[PDB]
From a paper:
In the mevalonate pathway, the mevalonate diphosphate decarboxylase (MDD, EC: 4.1.1.33) is a rate-limiting enzyme, suggesting that inhibition of MDD could eliminate the products of the mevalonate pathway and accordingly shut down bacterial growth.
The investigation of the structural details of the MDDEF mechanism was aided by the discovery of crystallization conditions under which the introduction of substrates and cofactors by soaking resulted in activity in the crystal. These MDDEF crystals were grown at a high ammonium sulfate concentration (1.6 M)19 but subjected to buffer exchange into PEG3350 solutions before soaking with ligands. Other MVAPP-bound MDDs have stabilized phosphate-binding loops possibly due to crystal contacts directly involving this loop or the C-terminal insertion covering the corresponding β-strands in eukaryotic MDDs. In contrast to all other published structures, in the MDDEF structures, there is no crystal contact in the regions described above, which should allow the flexible loops to take up unrestricted conformations. In the physical mechanism, the phosphate-binding loop and the β10-α4 loop may be initially dynamic or disordered in an apo structure (left).
Author numbering:
A (entry chain A), B (entry chain A): 0 to 97, 104 to 182, 193 to 326
The structure:
């Protein structure tokens, strides 16, 4: 008496940021977001629901996860079990291949979809993954994907953005180096963030249509910096940046000054991701090898959407 | 046929920032600001107006200044000459003792006041110095000073803030490591800056009245960070910070975590200034000597207002 399933999901980098929740219970965002799914980073997850299991068990990269490390997986298992009326405890085994939490929750959503026979469409699998993490709902799709904020659980989900395979000409170079809710609630800059998101989304779409890289890069770099500005207006104010983040951002500006179009974006931690055309990736690595070690510069290209496996 | 005068003016650190101009010609600010005048840093300036001079000459620390280095001094000389109906070229000799541009313009304003016999009140000398630089108008005064934005040339000036000599219990530790107009005009965060200034000023005044140091420190640290957030919303966005600025800010937070009340503020360059009570200054220097050299840690205490000298 057991049900099992497996999925592989790739991480994604938000180019137009998901920043702030309108609804905490359902993970409905304050604004729509847009990402690029990446080939280099992914999670493979297997789930087993078995009447003989006595508790939920989460193993990540061979290591048994403790309660706090299992908290998001357990809450997702409860959600999908309640949706399926399944009364069994589960064993989740994930292996990261190297944002990972998000790819992991996307993979778990697909694995549970398989195991419980939910037969979900891509849209409804995105809606399910959304309940685990917002970024996870975009990793259901490959290449460029947009999470549409929606007004509700039914209308908030992600879809792929057809680029005419422009995504296959791009690359990301990773430079290895409570706050969101605080910012929504207390930051005097949050409204300015909200007022600029839709214009940014529109111009990304116009840039994708014309394959205009400098336009794409300028928009997404300013979008990321606008997100980071908001935390300096929160009460109390904070930054996600580390000294190395600033060094890396300044070096990307230097790179552009030498005629390499490239553009940086950051998330909720100090690392810096650089968008560049495939042509210039190695030149950028060499330039940044002046101030950072080989182990700190990691390339990635466009990746696929979620892959489901019957067990 | 010559007229001469001399003044000494001390620099000041803005605790509630002057950020943005309402009027560029008259230097009327978008908001009121509040500073502490410091003992350690000052400029002494002598001016001579002489019918025999053939051009304006500016010597700074013994070195003849070129045209671009003389631009602000020359514009100030023209302003004060037009106000006095004086047709003579001038020789300005300034010596920095070690923000310096601002202390230098305050000192020049006092020296011209003496030389041309303007017999200005402190208020009117502040109004004159304001035409050279906004910060200069506060350095007319010692200790705590507030530049009231006013609506006009007549109403925009600075005044000392009586503290019951609380300023003599404080200290600043300096850690040595176009954008303003761009931010006013393009930043989606500038209105949030404006909406929070007056509340900050009110609480500084309440803190001074009760000599409440943690309250003063919390307000001014958040005020500075709010100013810096606005530049990340400018078009194009930018930061004044350098990697070392972030390291220093993080170390100040660590210092507080160990029970040393202290609070950081930054201006338009990478250096970091730390407000602390006199009692703890040396402890802070020792703590920061872990990551910075002796030449990078410079203490200062409360300084006096402008001093005028007949020549």
């Amino acid at each position: 008496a057991m049900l099992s399933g497996k999925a592989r999901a790739h991480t994604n980098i938000a180019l137009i940021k998901y920043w702030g929740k309108a609804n905490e219970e359902y993970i409905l965002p304050m604004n729509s977001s847009l990402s690029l799914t990446l080939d280099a980073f992914y999670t493979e997850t297997t789930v087993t629901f078995d009447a003989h299991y006595s508790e939920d068990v989460f193993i990540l990269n061979g290591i048994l996860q403790n309660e706090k490390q299992t908290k998001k997986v357990k809450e997702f298992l409860n959600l999908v079990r309640q949706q399926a009326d399944c009364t069994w405890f589960a064993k989740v085994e994930s292996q990261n291949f190297v944002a990972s939490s998000a790819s992991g929750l996307a993979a778990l959503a697909g694995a549970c979809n398989v195991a419980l026979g939910l037969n979900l469409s891509a849209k409804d699998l995105s809606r399910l993954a959304r309940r685990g993490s917002g970024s996870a709902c975009r990793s259901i799709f490959g290449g460029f994907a947009q999470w549409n904020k929606g007004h509700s659980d039914e209308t908030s989900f992600a879809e792929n953005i057809p680029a005419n395979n422009w995504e296959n000409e791009l690359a990301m170079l990773f430079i290895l180096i409570d706050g969101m809710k605080r910012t929504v609630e207390t930051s005097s800059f949050y409204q300015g963030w909200l007022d600029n998101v839709e214009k940014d989304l529109s111009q990304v779409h116009e840039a994708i249509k014309t394959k205009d890289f400098p336009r794409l890069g300028e928009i997404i770099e300013a979008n990321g910096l606008r997100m980071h500005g908001t935390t300096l207006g929160a009460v109390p104010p904070f930054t996600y940046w580390s000294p190395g983040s600033l060094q890396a951002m300044a070096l990307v500006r230097q790179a552009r000054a030498k005629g390499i179009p490239c553009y940086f974006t950051m998330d909720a931690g100090p690392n810096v991701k650089v968008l560049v055309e495939k042509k210039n990736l190695e030149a950028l690595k060499t330039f940044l090898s002046e101030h950072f070690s080989k182990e700190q510069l990691v390339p990635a290209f466009a990746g696929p959407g979620i892959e489901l496996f019957e067990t």
